[PDB]
Amino acid sequence: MLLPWLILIPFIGGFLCWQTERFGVKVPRWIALITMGLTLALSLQLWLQGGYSLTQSAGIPQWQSEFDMPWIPRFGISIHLAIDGLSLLMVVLTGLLGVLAVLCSWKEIEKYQGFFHLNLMWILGGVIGVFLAIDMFLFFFFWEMMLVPMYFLIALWGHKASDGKTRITAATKFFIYTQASGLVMLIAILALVFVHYNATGVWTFNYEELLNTPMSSGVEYLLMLGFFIAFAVKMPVVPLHGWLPDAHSQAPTAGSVDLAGILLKTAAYGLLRFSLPLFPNASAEFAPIAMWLGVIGIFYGAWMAFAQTDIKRLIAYTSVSHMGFVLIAIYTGSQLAYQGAVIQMIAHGLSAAGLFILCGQLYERIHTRDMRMMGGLWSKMKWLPALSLFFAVATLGMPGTGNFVGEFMILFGSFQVVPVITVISTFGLVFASVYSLAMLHRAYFGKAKSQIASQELPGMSLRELFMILLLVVLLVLLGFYPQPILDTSHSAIGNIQQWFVNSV
Amino acid sequence: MNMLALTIILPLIGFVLLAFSRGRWSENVSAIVGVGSVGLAALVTAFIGVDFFANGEQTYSQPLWTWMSVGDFNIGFNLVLDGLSLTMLSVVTGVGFLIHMYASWYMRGEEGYSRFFAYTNLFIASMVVLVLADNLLLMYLGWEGVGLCSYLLIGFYYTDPKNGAAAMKAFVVTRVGDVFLAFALFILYNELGTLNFREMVELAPAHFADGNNMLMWATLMLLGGAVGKSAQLPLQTWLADAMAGPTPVSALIHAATMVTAGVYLIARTHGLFLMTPEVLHLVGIVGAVTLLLAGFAALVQTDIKRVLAYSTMSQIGYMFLALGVQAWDAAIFHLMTHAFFKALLFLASGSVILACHHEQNIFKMGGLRKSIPLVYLCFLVGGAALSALPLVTAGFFSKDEILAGAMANGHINLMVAGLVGAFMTSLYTFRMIFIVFHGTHSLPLIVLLILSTFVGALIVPPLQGVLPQTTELAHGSMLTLEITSGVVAVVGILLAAWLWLGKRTLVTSIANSAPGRLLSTWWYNAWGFDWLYDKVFVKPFLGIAWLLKRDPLNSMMNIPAVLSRFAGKGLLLSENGYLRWYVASMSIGAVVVLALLMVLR
Ligand SMILES: CCCCCCCCCCCCCCCCCC(=O)OC[C@H](COP(=O)(O)OCCN)OC(=O)CCCCCCCCCCCCCCCCC
Ligand SMILES: CCCCCCCCCCCCCCCCCC(=O)OC[C@H](COP(=O)(O)OCCN)OC(=O)CCCCCCCCCCCCCCCCC
Ligand SMILES: CCCCCCCCCCCCCCCCCC(=O)OC[C@H](COP(=O)(O)OCCN)OC(=O)CCCCCCCCCCCCCCCCC
Numbered sequence A: 001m002l003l004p005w006l007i008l009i010p011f012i013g014g015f016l017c018w019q020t021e022r023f024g025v026k027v028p029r030w031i032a033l034i035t036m037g038l039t040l041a042l043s044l045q046l047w048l049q050g051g052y053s054l055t056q057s058a059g060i061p062q063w064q065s066e067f068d069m070p071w072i073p074r075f076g077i078s079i080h081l082a083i084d085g086l087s088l089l090m091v092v093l094t095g096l097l098g099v100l101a102v103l104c105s106w107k108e109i110e111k112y113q114g115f116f117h118l119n120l121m122w123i124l125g126g127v128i129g130v131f132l133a134i135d136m137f138l139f140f141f142f143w144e145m146m147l148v149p150m151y152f153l154i155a156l157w158g159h160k161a162s163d164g165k166t167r168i169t170a171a172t173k174f175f176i177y178t179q180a181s182g183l184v185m186l187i188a189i190l191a192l193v194f195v196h197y198n199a200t201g202v203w204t205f206n207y208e209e210l211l212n213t214p215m216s217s218g219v220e221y222l223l224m225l226g227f228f229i230a231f232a233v234k235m236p237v238v239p240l241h242g243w244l245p246d247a248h249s250q251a252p253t254a255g256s257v258d259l260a261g262i263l264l265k266t267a268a269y270g271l272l273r274f275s276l277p278l279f280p281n282a283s284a285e286f287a288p289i290a291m292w293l294g295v296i297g298i299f300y301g302a303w304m305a306f307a308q309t310d311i312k313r314l315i316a317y318t319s320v321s322h323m324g325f326v327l328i329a330i331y332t333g334s335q336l337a338y339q340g341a342v343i344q345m346i347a348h349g350l351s352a353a354g355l356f357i358l359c360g361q362l363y364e365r366i367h368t369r370d371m372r373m374m375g376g377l378w379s380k381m382k383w384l385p386a387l388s389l390f391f392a393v394a395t396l397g398m399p400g401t402g403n404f405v406g407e408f409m410i411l412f413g414s415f416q417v418v419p420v421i422t423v424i425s426t427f428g429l430v431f432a433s434v435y436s437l438a439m440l441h442r443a444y445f446g447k448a449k450s451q452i453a454s455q456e457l458p459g460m461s462l463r464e465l466f467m468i469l470l471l472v473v474l475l476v477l478l479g480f481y482p483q484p485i486l487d488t489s490h491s492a493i494g495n496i497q498q499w500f501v502n503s504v
Numbered sequence B: 001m002n003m004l005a006l007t008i009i010l011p012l013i014g015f016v017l018l019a020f021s022r023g024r025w026s027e028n029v030s031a032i033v034g035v036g037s038v039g040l041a042a043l044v045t046a047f048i049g050v051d052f053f054a055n056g057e058q059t060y061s062q063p064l065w066t067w068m069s070v071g072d073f074n075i076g077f078n079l080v081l082d083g084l085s086l087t088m089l090s091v092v093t094g095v096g097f098l099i100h101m102y103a104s105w106y107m108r109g110e111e112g113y114s115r116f117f118a119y120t121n122l123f124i125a126s127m128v129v130l131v132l133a134d135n136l137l138l139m140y141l142g143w144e145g146v147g148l149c150s151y152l153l154i155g156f157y158y159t160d161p162k163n164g165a166a167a168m169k170a171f172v173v174t175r176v177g178d179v180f181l182a183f184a185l186f187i188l189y190n191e192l193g194t195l196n197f198r199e200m201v202e203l204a205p206a207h208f209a210d211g212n213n214m215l216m217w218a219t220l221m222l223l224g225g226a227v228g229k230s231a232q233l234p235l236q237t238w239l240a241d242a243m244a245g246p247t248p249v250s251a252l253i254h255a256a257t258m259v260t261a262g263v264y265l266i267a268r269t270h271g272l273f274l275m276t277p278e279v280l281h282l283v284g285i286v287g288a289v290t291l292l293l294a295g296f297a298a299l300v301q302t303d304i305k306r307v308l309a310y311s312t313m314s315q316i317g318y319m320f321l322a323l324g325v326q327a328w329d330a331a332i333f334h335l336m337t338h339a340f341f342k343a344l345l346f347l348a349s350g351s352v353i354l355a356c357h358h359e360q361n362i363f364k365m366g367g368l369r370k371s372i373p374l375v376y377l378c379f380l381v382g383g384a385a386l387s388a389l390p391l392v393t394a395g396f397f398s399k400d401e402i403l404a405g406a407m408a409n410g411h412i413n414l415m416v417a418g419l420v421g422a423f424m425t426s427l428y429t430f431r432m433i434f435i436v437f438h439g440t441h442s443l444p445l446i447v448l449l450i451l452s453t454f455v456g457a458l459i460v461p462p463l464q465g466v467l468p469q470t471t472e473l474a475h476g477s478m479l480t481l482e483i484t485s486g487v488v489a490v491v492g493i494l495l496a497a498w499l500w501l502g503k504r505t506l507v508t509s510i511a512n513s514a515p516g517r518l519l520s521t522w523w524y525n526a527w528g529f530d531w532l533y534d535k536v537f538v539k540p541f542l543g544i545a546w547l548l549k550r551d552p553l554n555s556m557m558n559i560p561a562v563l564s565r566f567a568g569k570g571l572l573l574s575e576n577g578y579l580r581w582y583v584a585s586m587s588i589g590a591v592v593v594l595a596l597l598m599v600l601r
C-alpha cells in the first residue's frame, strides 16, 4: 500500500515542476529535488521496515509488500505492485540516480526547464513502475511509457553542439528499437495469456497466475524468444546494441538523462523476474546461445570502447561489456552468480553514472569531447582527473570497488556452471582494463594537443564535488562491505534460482 | 599482539590525507605525514615482531569482518600471521620506510610530491594486505592493489607518453597474470569450497584421491599468476620497461613489494604444490630459464636501471629455482637479502643519476669513483652482495643455501644453471660497475649498507614451523659447493676486471663481429620476447580495433531501415497522379482478386 506512492510521487512532482515554472524560472529544480528526495527517503523507509535481511527463500510468489487494484477487468488486468529485495534495491538505486540527475541539471536556468524536469520525473517514475509491476500489461505499459519523455529529452534538450538533425536521428533510432522490442514482448505476453486461457478458462495478465502454465516446447521457446528480444534491446545485447552509443552521445550534455533513463538497466531485472520463472525449460535450452551472446558482447564492447574517439561512446560500450557479463550470469543456475549479477548491476550503475557526470563536467569546462584533441589535463584542473581516474579504476574491475565484487561472484558461479565461458570472460576483464587505461591515457595524461587543453580550467563546484564524492563513498563501501546488499537480495535471488533449477 | 590492522590502516590514512591535500600543504608537512605513516607502520611491525617472538612463534589470527557470504561462498576479511607473514611484513615496512626517507630527500622541488607519497603509501598498504591475507581473495585484493599502484607509480611523470606506455604495458601484462590467478581461484573454490590457505591444505588430500588433474591445473594457474606478478617466463617483458618512473619507485617495486609477491604466493600455497610435483619442477625450470635469460640479457645493456632490472629478474629466477627444489627457507632468506641489496643498489643509482644530469648512457661516464666516494662504496657493496662475494656478503649465503637445497633434492641441472647464473651475475654486475665508475652520508644508505653485508645474513627468518625443513646436505659436499661457488664468483670478478677495466680491445672486437653484433642485438631486446608479444597480441588487437571502429553490427542492423526507405521510394512511383493509371490499377486489382478466388476455390 506504499508502492503506488513510490510511482505517483514522481508523476505528481513532474506535474508540479511544470506548473511551478510561472512562480520563477529557478523554482522547478527545487521541486524536483524535493520530490526525488521524498521518493528516495520513502524507498529507504521501505528498506528499513521491510526486514529483508531476516527473510528466507519461500518460493515464487513471495513479496514483502503488495498492492492490487482493478484496471481493465475485461482482460483481468490490474495495477498490481509488489516489492521484495531485488525490486527494492533497484528502486533505491533509481531514487538515488534521480536525485543525482536533478542535482546534475542544477545551474541550467533556461526557458521551459519545468518541462525538462517533468520528463525527468516521468522517466524516473516509469523506471520505478517497471521495477514494481508484477503483471504483464502494466509492466509493458511502464516499459514503453518511459520512452516518450526519453525521446523528447534527447531530441529537444540534447547536445547543443549537435546538428539538430543528428539528435532527431539518434532519438528516433532509440525509440524505434525500444518500441519494436516492446511490441514483440506484447505479442509474447498476449500469446502466453491466450495459452493460459485455453488451458484453464479464465482471463488474467498476472505473473503469479501465469506461472506453471502448461505449454509445449516450441510455444515456450517462442515466448522466451519474444521476451529475450525485448530485454536484449534494452540491456543491450549484441547485435541489438546500436541505439545506445548514439543515444548517450546525443543526450543532454549535463548527463542527467543518462542516469535517469539510459544508464539504469531494467532488462537484467526483467530477465530475472519474467524470463527464468515463466519459461525455465526454454531458458535452459537457450542458455548456450545467450551465454555466447554475452561473451561476444563483452569482447565486442571492449573492442568498440578502445576504438572510440569520444568519451561518451566509450562509456556506452563499457556498459555494453558489463551487461554482457550480467547476461552471462543470468542464464546459469547458480545463486552465487545471480548475487554477483545484482552487485554488478548496482556497482556498474554507480560507476558509469559517476563517469557520465564527470564527462558532462569536463565538456562544460572545455567545450569538446574529442579524446584526440585534449590531453594532459591532470595539471590543469583541481578535482576532475583524480575522480575520473578513480571511476576508471572502478569500471576496470578493481577491488575496493563493487564492480570487482560483482563480476567476480559472477565468474565464480559461472565457473561452477560452465568453465570455458568463464575463461573467455576473464580475458574480457583484461580487455576492460585495456580500454580503461586507453581512455585515461588519451584524456588526462601526456602533452596537451590543443590550446584549450593548454589553459587553466576552473575547478568543480561544491555540489558536483559532493555528489561525485557521495558516489565514490558508496562504491568503496559496496566494494569493502557488500553484505547488506547481498542480504537484501538473497531471498528474491534464492526464489528465482530455486524456481529455475528444479523445474527443468 | 593484534595491531596488524594498524599496520594496514596507517598507510591508508596517509594515502587519504595526502591525496585529499592535493598539493596545498608544504613539502615538509606532506613529507612528514607520509614518512611518519610508514615509519609508524614499521614501528608497529617491530612491536608485532617483539610480541610474536615473546610467545612460542604461534600463528595469530585477527578476523576483522566477513567480506562476502553467499551460501557456501564464505570469503572472510581476516588477517593471518606466521613466520612467513612476519618476514614479509617486516621486510615491506622496513625497506619501505628507508625508501620513503630517501624519496623525502629525493623528491624535493618536484611536482606531485603529495601525490607521489600518497601513491607509495597506498602501495605499502596494498602489499601489507597481500602478505597478511588469510584467504586467496584478500590476497587477490592486495594483488590488484599493488598492480594498480605499480601502474600509478611507473607513469608518475605522466607528461612523457613513453612513461604512460610503459605503465600500461606493465598493467596489461600483470592483469594477464592476475587472470591466470583468478583461474586458480575458480578451480580451487570449485574443487574445495573454500579459499583459506590452512583449510585448502587440510581438505586438499581427501578430495583428490581419485583425480589430480584439477589440483594440477590449480597449481599451474597459481604458477602462471606468480610469474605474471614476479616478471618471469613468459610474462617478464614489462619489468625492463618499468623504469620510466622514479628510482625510489623502482627500488620499491624491485626490492620491497612487487616482484616478491609471486614468491610469497608459491611459498604460502606450498601445501598444494607438494601434491603436484610436476608443477613444482616446472616452477624450478621456469626460474632457471628466467635467471639464465636475464643474465644473458643484462650483459649487453647500456643503462644502469635496465641492468638492475634484469639483475632483479635473475634474482627472482633464483628464488623460483629455490622454490622448485623445495628449498623454501633458502628462498625466503634470499628474498630478505636481495630486497636489502637491491634497495641499496637502486638508491645508489638514483643518487648517481641525480648527481649527474640528463640520465645518460653508462658508456659516456668513467672514473666516477673519485667524484662520489660514498655512492661508489654503496654501489661496490651492493655489487659484491649481488655477485655473491664469499664470507662478507649475505648474497653468498643466500645463493649457497639455494644451491645446497638444489643438491640435496638431486637437482643437478638446476645446480649447474644456478652456477652459470652466478657467474653471469658477477660478470654483468662488475661489468656495469667498472664501466660507469672506472675509466652526504644519508642514513637509509648507511642502513642498507649495513644490511647488505654479513650483518644481514646474521638475521634468520622464523620459518621453522610454517615451511617444511630443507633436506640437509653432507658436510663435504656442502664445503665443496661453497668452494665451487667462491671460485666461480671470483673467476667472474677477475674476468670482468680483465675485459671491461682497461683498454677494452677484446670486448670491442667481440662486439664488432657480425655474430657478436647479432648476439648483442638479440640479448638487448630480451631475446625477442617484446617483439614476439607485440606481433602476436598488440598488432592484431589494434588491427581488429581499426577494422571494427565503424560498428559493423550497427550497419547489419541498420540495413532494414535502408530496405524500408528503398521500398518506400519504389512504392511511391505508383502515385504518379494519373487517373487513367488509377483506373488501370483498380482493374488490375480486380483481375488479381478474381484470379485468386478462382485459384483458391
Ligand atoms: C585498501 C587498502 C589497499 C588495498 C588495495 C586497494 C586498491 C583500490 C584502491 C582505489 C583507490 C583509488 C586509487 C586510484 C585513484 C587515485 C586518485 C589520486 O591520484 O589521488 C591523488 C590526488 C592528488 O594528486 P595531486 O597531483 O596532488 O592533485 C591533483 C590536481 N591538483 O587526489 C585528489 O585529487 C583528491 C582525491 C581523489 C580521490 C582519491 C581516492 C578516493 C577513493 C578512496 C577514499 C574514499 C574516501 C574515504 C572513505 C571511504 C568509505 C569509508
Ligand atoms: C583492505 C584494507 C584493510 C581493511 C581496512 C580498510 C578497508 C577500507 C575502509 C573503507 C571501507 C570500510 C568498509 C567496512 C567497515 C567495517 C565493516 C563492519 O563494521 O563490519 C562489522 C564488524 C563487526 O564484527 P562482526 O560482528 O563479526 O561482523 C561481521 C561482518 N560481516 O566490524 C568490525 O569488526 C570493525 C573492525 C574495525 C574496522 C576499522 C576500519 C577502519 C578503516 C579506515 C580506512 C581509512 C581509509 C579509507 C579509504 C581506503 C581506500 C579505499
Ligand atoms: C605466446 C604464448 C604465451 C602467451 C603469454 C600470455 C600473453 C602475454 C601478453 C604480454 C604482452 C602484452 C602487451 C600489451 C601492451 C599494452 C601497452 C601498449 O602497447 O599500448 C599501446 C596502445 C595504447 O593505446 P592508445 O591510447 O591508442 O595509444 C596511442 C598510440 N599508442 O595500446 C594497445 O595497443 C593495446 C594493447 C592491448 C593488448 C591486449 C593483450 C591481450 C593478451 C591476451 C593473452 C592471452 C593468453 C592466452 C592465449 C591463448 C592460450 C591458449
Ligand SMILES: CCCCCCCCCCCCCCCCCCCC
Binding pocket: B035, B036, B039, B040, B042, B043, B046, B086, B087, B090, B091, B094, B095, B097, B098, B336, B447, B459, B460, B461, B462
Ligand atoms: C617514525 C618512527 C620510525 C621507526 C623506524 C623503525 C625501523 C628502523 C629503520 C628501518 C630498518 C629496517 C630493517 C629491516 C629488517 C627486517 C628483518 C626481517 C626479519 C624476519
